[PDB]
Design a protein around this nucleic acid. Sequence first.
RNA 1: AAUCCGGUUAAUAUUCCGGAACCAGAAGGUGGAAUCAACACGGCAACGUAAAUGAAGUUGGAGACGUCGGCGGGAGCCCUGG
Lengths: 69, 94, 106, 248, 29, 135, 93
Amino acid sequence: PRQISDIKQFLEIARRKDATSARIKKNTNKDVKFKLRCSKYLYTLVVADAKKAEKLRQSLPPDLTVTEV
Amino acid sequence: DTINAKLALTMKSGKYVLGYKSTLKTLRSGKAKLILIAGNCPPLRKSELEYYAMLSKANVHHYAGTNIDLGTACGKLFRVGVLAITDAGDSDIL
Amino acid sequence: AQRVTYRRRLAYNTRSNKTRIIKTPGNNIRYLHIKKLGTIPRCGDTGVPLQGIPALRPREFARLSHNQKKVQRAYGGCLSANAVKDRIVRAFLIEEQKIVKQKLKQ
Amino acid sequence: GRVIRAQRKSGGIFQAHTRLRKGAAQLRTLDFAERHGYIRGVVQKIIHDPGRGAPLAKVAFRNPYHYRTDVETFVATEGMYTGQFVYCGKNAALTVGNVLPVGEMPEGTIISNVEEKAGDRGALGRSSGNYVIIVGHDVDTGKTRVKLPSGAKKVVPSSARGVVGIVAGGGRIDKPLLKAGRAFHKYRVKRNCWPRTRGVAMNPVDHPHGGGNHQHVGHSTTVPRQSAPGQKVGLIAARRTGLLRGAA
Amino acid sequence: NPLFVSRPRSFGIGQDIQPKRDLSRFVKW
Amino acid sequence: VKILKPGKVALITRGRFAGKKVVILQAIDQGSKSHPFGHAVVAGVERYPLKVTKSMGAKRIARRSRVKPFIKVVNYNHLMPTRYALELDNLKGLITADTFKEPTQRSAARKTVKKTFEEKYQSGKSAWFFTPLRF
Amino acid sequence: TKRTKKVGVTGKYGVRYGASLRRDVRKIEVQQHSRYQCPFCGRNTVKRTAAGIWCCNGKGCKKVLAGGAWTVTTAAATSARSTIRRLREMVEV
RNA sequence: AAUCCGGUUAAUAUUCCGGAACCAGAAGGUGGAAUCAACACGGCAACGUAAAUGAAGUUGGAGACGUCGGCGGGAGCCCUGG
Ligand SMILES: [Zn+2]
């Protein structure tokens, strides 16, 4: 598992072909984890702001399969 | 005359440089006339010092005795490897 | 307290049976078999360990990039900096001695 | 009777323990360089050879005919230090650690690892603290007379090589072992010859000295030279016996 | 032209590696 | 009287270019606000030209007889001075201590030193400078 | 405190092996476990390893010397060195 | 040379399931670098980087190593306050 901290890098790795599925995990501390399942690694992005999380979800590629756990 | 007495009176009235790094600095700066190399010196270091003195036109004396003997002659309680006499003072070392 | 068992059929405390205690996310204390510690490459002239090179098993060096297994210098990753400097000075001085010997012969 | 321990020492159990040994201590192959000039090698290691009381010297030489470095296993002489240069050949200097033909050395010189024949690569004076003295030369049918550590005089061809100096290791036999354990550890890396059981403490089936109501040999311990195996025990072909007080 | 510098080999004892000459006399036939 | 003066040839004993032969452009014993010690500005050869024989073509000889230089500030303790020296016909005052702050300035100075070194190697009056040191 | 009248280093041997043998071992071990001076570095750092090998530590002069069993140099070797030095000078001159 | 966690059977688990990794071998889609000419830079040095051409031949290192005694650090266990 690998962790990303760059929003644009996560968007690029999501737009990459090997990116298949995305998982949304909400924690009790008001943090949202975006987990991208690539061929080799699972990439996790941690977002602390719900306002930024909503815009991140909107800017995410709609053709990508995203589920919430 | 001997050289131990001459070294002692240069110590009383003269300019001396102790060690290897400072001797190289003095030879590089050109303010060097005589260098004394102990018999216990590394051969590679001796060749390097001889090359430095040949470049800087400085005289070389590889006197007998170990670095302990050189330090004792210099009047110090530690081992001295290379001596650099920059100013002879009132002596005829050079 | 919890007591552990070997996870393999080797039942002896050999050099290839090194184990470490781990606490799994199930409140289970159990062994974890680990390899031997790596070794830093040594200088070929003085035997001192080489600076800037990690300690790994011989096969693990094949997966590292080239610059991680050496130093950017002549004889880098095979000889230390002091050894390289001594060889350079010794080489230059002896070649000079050869030249002056030939000139004095002529 | 039964086969005695001396007859049983033909091999097998009584073989030498040579796992930890670093190699044979032969000088070098007598080549053109050593026969017509000299060759310079640099000593790089001085190591302890288990079962041997003298240090061994690993010396690197340049191959004259191939792009390759050859490492030798010289018997280290006292005063040898790592990083020094040794010279092997006819024109080598008379310096400690140098290998020169015996016939090219001045009379009375001290040498070690001397060859009995040309190309033998070292036979005489190889133990620690031992040496050979060049007694004299004889040009007509070139032969050199030398003195061996045992005191004997040997004539060798005036082309055999030798190492100038004394074998390192000093006088090792000057310290008492002081312990059976020290003797056990000494001989463990050498062979299975220790401890030794006396023949008089044995039975008649085991040794010729065994048997009797008292521990005694019964016959003379001086046996003839041409004794059969199994009875050649004690003092074989003893010219003399007992304590001697003053002789040559 | 000035860069074409002769580089001879002494081929003496202990000087340089011997050249590959004819060894037919000493061949183990 | 100074063992290290501009135009002198020295050998580098420490750093990436260890064992390389360099020529001193200026021996600045004192120092300014930055580098206030006894450093030397040198120009050396990173890759020595390869040997060329009479049996090679003109294009191959031109390709092989090329020198890529480096300009570096090296302190005195990491230098081995020689007496072969260099003419320094062109590299006299064009390159200054200010030529180390701009990467473009460094590239321009390196290009100029490359031109001078290649021209000196062609019809080489100093073959020792351009032959590699074998150690 | 003196802690030992005469046995010294042989105090580890207790009362066994005999007084004369203990005395001979005491002299040998005193020679054996002694720091000597490197003839090239001038530092009293030469120590014995494995009966004939002597090494001194430090940043420089990591040489390994071939010496005696428990002394760096023996009298016989020194005499031989002098004899060989004399013979070499006669041959050269 | 390279695997861990959790779960699963009446009986198998580092082997099955779920999740998350690693190694070796085979072929070879990008991409930045550098080239209008040769195969990158930085640091006064130890040395560092995302790559930073390298055939033989040679050399060096790792593999690769005894035993005892004290000292210091870490993991697990033990102990203890809410
Ligand atoms: Zn020393």
